[PDB]
Amino acid sequence: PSSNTLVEMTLGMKKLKEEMEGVVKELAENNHILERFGSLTMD
């Protein structure tokens, strides 16, 4: 609850949110490729 603690926690928490934005886009891409896997043995 000290200033320094809250500043450092804030920085960290904002960084975690940023990284997860990146992660979920990675997952989105994973989902897309997986969807395409189901079409390899078709036509």
Partner: protein, 74 residues
């Protein structure tokens, strides 16, 4: 802007709640992806076996036909 750009304890807690939710949804989605990938794998394995079997049927038909021909052009 140190006062504005610094979270309160209550906002930090809120953020922690939100990251937990995002991580849980992430975990559960990856479980589903693994299940589906295992399905895609069995499908592709079954399919390649079917293809090999059909290829062989045709190689055999072709060889028999090439032979029946010779066994009469004579």
């Amino acid at each position: 802007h140190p006062n504005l750009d610094t979270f309160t304890p209550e906002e930090l807690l809120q953020q922690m709640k939100e990251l937990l939710t995002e991580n849980h949804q992430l975990k559960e989605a990856m479980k589903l992806n693994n299940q589906a990938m295992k399905g895609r794998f069995e499908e592709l394995s079954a399919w390649t076996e079917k293809q090999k079997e059909e290829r062989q049927f045709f190689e055999i038909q072709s060889k028999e036909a090439k032979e029946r021909l010779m066994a009469l052009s004579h």
